[PDB]
Design a protein around this ligand. Structure first.
Ligand SMILES: *C(=O)Cn1cc(CCOP(=O)(O)Oc2c3c(c(OP(=O)(O)O)c4c2[C@H]2C[C@@H]4c4cc5c(cc42)[C@H]2C[C@@H]5c4ccccc42)[C@H]2C[C@@H]3c3cc4c(cc32)[C@H]2C[C@@H]4c3ccccc32)nn1
Ligand code: NA
Ligand code: NA
Ligand code: NA
Lengths: 230, 10, 231
């Protein structure tokens, strides 16, 4: 990689510069170089990797939706399909980079529960993103790969984290949206969102100072979805 | 900082 | 290059799709391909190429400004800020070089209407102005000379072939006057341009049409908005 001759601490430093400049492609490239040094990320470094690649694929998905929509209005000429396919291929390239980093460097049996859940949930998210644009046999394997990563994350978080934990709630929220938008299982979507919300309320005594803010916003998103689906 | 943004909520 | 196998009409069409999805790099790449087919661009196509590269350099200028600012607050340990500012600087320079390459290679001609010849000569001035913002010493002097020279060519064409009230002539004057003040350190030339521009426009204001008796007015306010700010 072009980041191999750079110091770990300088790659982290320029990832922060890239963020302040809103240069997410560079932020991602720097954080990828950092991960390749082969040391465990701190919680803060983990968050920078995730922020950087969330912004890259986030922009590409939004661009895919605009084009995918303009294509469907031709209900023709090949231009819109072609351009949608170009953007699609770039999004698949970035998703493969992140899954490659997760499998190669970040997902392990060892390390705290928060890290093992956060990473398995990322794996679920990026397979979810590949599922949105995929077809046929590829699509089936990709949806099985998402559910499976999400499911592993859920087993770790039910065993090792309180029901109020923001990473556990965010895993449930995203898994529940997978069920709804991807796996065509409104029933599993509504059931997960409801048991997630209710279990946090029944164990509210566990809600920490450090999660009060993040867990309360995630609980509102769980509720808002239940209201949209019922 | 960043955990909420980092969790890339759907 | 990469767009050589695509139909001109297909490149225009995809530049518009790119704009709707706010993918300004792709939009610019598609328009560069269209220009490379070697045919004149229309007023609409002209505007698409302009909007595309204006968004690409605009994002890079703004990122350079953020890094250049964080670099100065290192007054007050590490070469990282400077290195990253240089990386972004070089990308900005690369995009400006691409646009000047297109204007000199394909778009700037003795032929075509006055509007198209002024549009392209002004864009050359704008992109040299952008290179001047990040440049130093001898390179910076050559670049400021190149800008003035392009702006001045555009001014000679607009003074001879457009009426005083014409929006394109007024917008060229505005931009050129700001270059004088903010880049070339010539307050005297900046004031003189804005004054002769406003006075000549004012003397023919009775002629001004509906189709463009709005833009013309807005720019005429900015001429005198800055005249009092420079006195
Ligand atoms: C990085 O590693 C360190 N880190 C952690 C965090 C997030 C959690 O840290 P914390 O400081 O404990 O949370 C917190 C934040 C903010 C504010 O400021 P503000 O609300 O006045 O703008 C506060 C808190 C603490 C102290 C203050 C506050 C108010 C309230 C609660 C908790 C806190 C409880 C009662 C009241 C409240 C309203 C809504 C829900 C829960 C509570 C700033 C920085 C962090 C924070 C998180 C969030 C927001 C603003 C702040 C925005 C986005 C997220 C959020 C959730 C819900 C509503 C609004 C917001 N950061 N860095
Ligand atoms: Na294409
Ligand atoms: Na052309
Ligand atoms: Na750099």
């Amino acid at each position: 990689g072009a980041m191999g001759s750079m110091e770990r601490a300088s790659l982290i430093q320029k990832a922060k510069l890239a963020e302040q400049a809103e240069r997410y492609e560079d932020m991602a490239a720097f954080m990828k170089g950092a991960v390749e040094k082969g040391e465990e990320l701190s919680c803060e470094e983990r968050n920078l990797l995730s922020v950087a690649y969330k912004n890259v694929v986030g922009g590409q998905r939004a661009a895919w939706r605009v084009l995918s929509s303009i294509e469907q209005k031709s209900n023709k000429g090949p231009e819109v399909r072609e351009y949608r396919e170009k953007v699609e291929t770039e999004l698949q390239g970035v998703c493969d980079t992140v899954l490659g980093l997760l499998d190669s460097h970040l997902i392990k049996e060892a390390g705290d529960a928060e890290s093992r859940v956060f990473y398995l949930k990322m794996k679920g998210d990026y397979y979810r993103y590949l599922a949105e644009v995929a077809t046929g046999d590829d699509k089936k394997r990709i949806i099985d790969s998402a559910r499976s990563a999400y499911q592993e994350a859920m087993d770790i978080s039910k065993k090792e984290m309180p029901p109020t934990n923001p990473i556990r709630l965010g895993l449930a929220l995203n898994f529940s949206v997978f069920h709804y938008e991807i796996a065509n299982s409104p029933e599993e979507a509504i059931s997960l969102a409801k048991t997630t919300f209710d279990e946090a309320m029944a164990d509210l005594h566990t809600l920490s100072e450090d999660s009060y803010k993040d867990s309360t916003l995630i609980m509102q998103l769980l509720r808002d979805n239940l209201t949209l689906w019922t | 900082q960043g955990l909420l943004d980092a969790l890339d909520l759907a």
